[PDB]
């Protein structure tokens, strides 16, 4: 049994912590505020069964923001190809990627 005492009484005992996109002190944003907001605006009011299938792409984007497996895999592939081309000797790194750029500001 889940007795919703808080909704019956109007108190707010643990809803402030329950999500990351909630009211945070000093208006500090999280890394995945937008993705979580979009996923919540999907799943609200349609139940879990419909929300598990209807706009799953919002949840995939949220999970990709959270854990970042695809970005890590893409960086791994790019760096592996760069290492292979560097060792076989047909790629020269640019000056700005070797610490000789004298950055903008």
């Amino acid at each position: 049994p889940f007795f919703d005492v808080q909704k019956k009484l109007g108190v707010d005992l643990d809803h402030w912590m329950t999500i990351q996109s909630a009211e945070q002190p000093h208006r500090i944003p999280a890394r995945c505020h937008a993705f979580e907001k979009e996923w919540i605006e999907c799943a609200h009011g349609i139940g879990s069964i419909r929300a598990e299938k209807e706009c799953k792409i919002e949840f995939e984007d949220f999970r990709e923001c959270l854990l970042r497996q695809k970005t890590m895999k893409r960086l791994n592939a790019i760096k592996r190809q760069r290492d292979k081309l560097i060792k076989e000797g047909k790629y020269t790194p640019p000056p700005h990627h070797s610490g000789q750029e004298d950055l903008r500001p």
Partner: protein
């Protein structure tokens, strides 16, 4: 995902297998339990700090407080059984087989 997450999961699994196989003493079981809590602390803290979840930063303090109260209760129980039998061996806690 990341790598230090894998290391903290493997540390938790090592401490869990240590707890789940007693050797001789109850104190070693308590130490394995508290190492499990420490691994939970590190994992949750790293996830919360990397995710920039500001309001979740209070959770590991509450986790530490509650599990240290748990450990105080366990130490009191260990002291009671040591006063009963003269040692904290796990082979003396076998009266309730009958």
């Amino acid at each position: 995902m990341s790598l230090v997450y894998m290391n903290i999961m493997m540390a938790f699994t090592v401490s869990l297998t240590g707890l789940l196989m007693y050797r001789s003493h109850l104190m070693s079981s308590l130490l394995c339990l508290e190492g499990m809590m420490l691994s939970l602390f590190i994992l949750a803290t790293l996830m919360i700090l990397n995710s920039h979840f500001t309001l979740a930063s209070m959770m590991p303090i509450i986790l530490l407080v509650f599990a240290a109260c748990e450990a105080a209760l366990g130490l009191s129980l260990l002291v009671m059984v040591s006063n009963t039998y003269g040692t904290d061996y796990v082979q003396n806690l076998n009266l309730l087989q009958c």
